[PDB]
Symmetry: D2
């Protein structure tokens, strides 16, 4: 049978608990993550915006921007890839479906769609408002109905904690899973106990977003495991470090007129070749001919 | 008149001596380069291959992979971008021209094409051969002829020094310039005096590739100015540092079950927002509307 | 100065009265239009949806699908191209601007945005509602502000006549123009006198959509000139004819087991070659080289 | 199991004899072909060049141009799609592989790669020279080794008749199949008897290119069946008719200032809606919600 990246994502879930899922900004970093041992990786929507487009995460990126990053990554790295699909790239059910199908075809193992509103008017400032529960149930149903690969994962993310409180966020989660959501991503959780409540309310795996500088403390895998969390997500960790490292290089080069003093911060040429399996290419040729 | 990235590039050469040109792997890093004060940036061919595609620099990347990175970068960053165009993405004058016109429309300020032979047969193993002086002259002729913007830059890159000795290298350079080459990128120089020799032989600005872990010394901008070099290129510097920092994070997070111990290696959220001009978006809305 | 597709478009309006603008479904047809003598062409939104994607005109096509057709067309055909941008490909001023800047860089001469509401909820059924006059004014303001080429055209399209009656339609048009709209595309007019009324109310060129099988009569260029209309648009005309001819071939070939009986309905090989300037390629080679 | 378009292509081969495979210039025409009853369709390389890019078929199009046409078509039409992959879009085995994998991922059921040389020097005029037998065997092996879906079809096309005669073309064909080719495409065959000779020399299915104005007469499906031909190909038939129909529309509109006299040559609005299953969209919404 043909390989199903979703199938592999769900398998990796069965094998690791919690499953650590790391953000990979580009194909090169996906290889680095694969080498470090991860079993699943991630395409952050904020990273596509900030890193690939140099834009804030305000809904400016398009499906196309994300699709090309998904292909670049999955063309060279076989690890299953979870994709941040925002609110579906379009208001209509027709848009949600095209996004789902395009993403599966581009190579992704799954995606998460959230309940945010986006922008309602040309001058609508960036906001965290969320649609009604019903509206989100409709997005979820449209997305699930669109799965062309039964094993592709449709995860539902809720940002209801900040604007409606815990009990309402949990309640929405139960309705989302009821509508078809296969996994749950409760955003900005503040206490380990809350995760357990979500774990207990919905009988599907839950993801905990362990991002760098927000509302959620830096919970360990052991702590998350105790809270019955099925996945730990680090959406931009590598990216943040990469930026500081590049910045420092740019600054020193500009200040000193040579990079001599930051050489020791650099991945060597040999290391880079190892990372992209440079020599496995010479092998491919030897195996095929000459 | 309409803005010309090429003209601005030529203008940058007059404002700095030598002009520092730093490789920017993506849109985000082009902005960090601009905020660090640079007046010109670069899109490394090996960088597109290794970072964007996770592939070795063996001619697998296509024009389209490079175009995408050109647009992402130049759509948000106004600095003139010099692009590595390998041999023109195709063996025919028709390919060279389509490449030039496409790179211009995508937003580039200039590009360099080299006299490399490339892959001859399907089973061709990586080799360092160069086409005849006449053949490169034809490539250069096709490139200049295709310019749709008179100020766009056609730079010729030659690896003749390591292949045919100095004098022959200089003989090619003179013929390349006479063919219309507007700037020269001589590869593999290990002594300042040599740069002076190229500078003396051709009346076009010359570029010094100060990349790491190669045969060439880490010359300083002042040393370079003393040899009459017009621009100093640092093709993958920030990239090499970003990979190491990212790698370090993936490993530490995997071993420790938390990234807590490497937070101090990360660009802060405020630094992220500032780097991508986050605050200019709401300011834009207030300026346009009520 | 650098060539401006927008400027050339504005210049076309002065050379013809009214300016005939024909929809060109692809690069090939843009060239047939140019060889037929036209001085301006059009990229229909429904055309990109129906011909390029094989989808109904229900807002499924994205900015990226339209950009690809803009580049393919303008990369080879120098005629100014007017583009259907629906409502800006996004609900935020940030989307409108990214759309304008992208269409300009892709090669377009101008675009029109309309005051349609679009899909509100995921389950929204096709509807003909329009935003408030103020909301469209904001969209128009964001669009004009984003122009990177001063001569690029921002045309406002309104379906207010069929929704709110003539006077209200004219009231919106005046406000749209005051907001910076450079040309007007009033929908659903069935009488020449009405065009004259719009022309009289706003001091900007007005466009008459002479599409087939709709509520509007097949007005002639002379009738249109008598009503003060500056340009006559034929959005899908050649497209509708091409599909029928193609359909006829598929059916005849399937029934007969040979296309022999429909050869006389086909563009000859000489006509193909001439249409795509085939002979200019070898001429280019002889002109550049030995 | 997941759907394999190659599997469906091979199935359609088993069911029809000869299998009629029709060229579809865009997604819309793929739907028309599906409606006319075809069981397999085709993406002509000359059509991507002439129709999508408005360029002659001289190796100017890139893999990217073809990949976007493959996605557009297969995203909306489920018929299996045979793709013209020229010589593999790149000289290296690494290029042949990336093309094969990219095309499978984009949705294609199979492709054909030929033994032409392309351009050897910048000024190399368009030609029909072909590589040695060995060189083509290497391309074929690289392509087969790259199949990510065992059912994807790798067809080998030979243009050796025009430059080496029949016996040599047959001999190459035997070597190509020996190297891994799954089907054979002998170009520009002039007599029914020749096909039978190919059919007899290689024990894999053979395709007969029944194109519009070349060396091959317009053989019927019955005649081809008698020659043991497994597939009949009509690469541009629909496209040629579509062009004449569009041209006539452009001319009449320009000459008469109205399209009234060519209305009867147009596919109606209702027909277009039927063709793109416009109303099946209203059904999707009714099934999902509201």
């Amino acid at each position: 049978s043909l390989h199903s990246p979703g199938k592999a994502f769900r398998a990796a879930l069965t094998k690791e608990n919690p499953l650590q899922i790391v953000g990979t900004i580009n194909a090169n970093h996906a290889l680095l993550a694969q080498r470090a041992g991860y079993q699943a990786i991630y395409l952050s929507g904020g990273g596509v915006a900030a890193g690939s487009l140099g834009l804030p995460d305000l809904g400016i990126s398009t499906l196309d921007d994300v699709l090309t990053d998904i292909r670049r990554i999955t063309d060279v790295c076989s690890l299953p890839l979870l994709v941040d699909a925002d609110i579906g790239f379009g208001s209509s059910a027709f848009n949600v479906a095209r996004t789902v199908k395009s993403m599966i075809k581009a190579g992704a193992a799954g995606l998460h769609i959230e309940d945010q509103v986006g922008a309602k008017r040309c001058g609508h400032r960036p906001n965290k408002a969320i649609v009604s529960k019903e509206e989100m149930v409709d997005r979820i149903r449209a997305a699930v109905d669109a799965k062309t690969d039964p094993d592709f994962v449709i995860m539902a993310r809720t940002d209801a904690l900040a604007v409606e409180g815990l009990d309402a966020a949990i309640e929405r989660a139960q309705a989302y899973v009821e509508a078809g959501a296969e996994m749950l991503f409760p955003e900005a959780i503040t206490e380990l106990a809350m995760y357990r409540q979500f774990a207990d309310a919905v009988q599907v795996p839950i993801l905990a977003n362990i991002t760098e500088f927000g509302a959620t403390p830096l919970f360990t895998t052991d702590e998350l495991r105790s809270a019955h969390v099925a996945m730990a997500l680090y959406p931009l960790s590598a990216f943040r470090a990469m930026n500081r490292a590049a910045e420092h290089v740019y600054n020193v080069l500009r200040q000193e007129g040579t990079q001599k003093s930051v050489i020791d911060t650099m991945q060597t040429r040999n290391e880079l070749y190892e990372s992209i399996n440079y020599y496995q290419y010479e092998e491919k040729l030897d195996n095929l001919f000459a």
